[PDB]
Design a protein around this ligand. Sequence first.
Ligand code: F72
Lengths: 99, 99
Amino acid sequence: PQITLWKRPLVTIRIGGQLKEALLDTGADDTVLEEMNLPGKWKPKMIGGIGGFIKVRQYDQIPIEICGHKAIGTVLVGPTPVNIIGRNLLTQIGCTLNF
Amino acid sequence: PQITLWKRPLVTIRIGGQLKEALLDTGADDTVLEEMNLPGKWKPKMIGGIGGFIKVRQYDQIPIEICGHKAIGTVLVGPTPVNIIGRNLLTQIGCTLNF
Ligand SMILES: O=C(N[C@@H](Cc1ccccc1)[C@H](O)CN(CC1CCCCC1)S(=O)(=O)c1ccc2ncsc2c1)c1cccc(O)c1
């Protein structure tokens, strides 16, 4: 598909039994999801942006479905105000910027 | 051009005869540049990111050439970690997400 940028590029993603709306975000190195109690091992991390840093939990090899495309990779979980699909997954679903 | 996402989508911009590197950031509503001098009136504004809110200076109708494409729009100046091109100017240069 082609997604214009008049509005926020929000799309439906699925992670287990949760469907969520998430930004397709070319500015995000990593994928950051709102607080959720995912199973398995994780490692603490701090990530920075406008305003400063937040503390997140890094989960590896988590399958995520983004607009029906399959991805699997690292997901950071913490008190972000918006679900963010970062470049680590955007590349996997074939996402480019075009102008 | 078509820009893939295995690397950060950094591009050269021209603003006030100065060249700068900026990130094409679909997750950003606004264009936000690191501290710099720009001519004219500005308005104080506050914006929010992943780590909270910051104070910026809002400049309107500022020309920027992004990777050869002309925009004229709102540019916020403040303590962003990195120069970012947001949706307000991404739309002006005809940028879309594709997969
Ligand atoms: O900060 C914004 N946008 C955010 C997304 C956003 C939207 C709305 C609310 C909060 C955040 C960015 O697109 C992604 N961030 C990465 C940062 C951006 C700042 C400087 C460079 C790198 S980010 O969110 O801070 C971010 C994301 C992934 C990641 N992985 C490793 S470090 C890291 C940082 C934003 C949103 C709306 C208006 C606005 O003026 C700015």
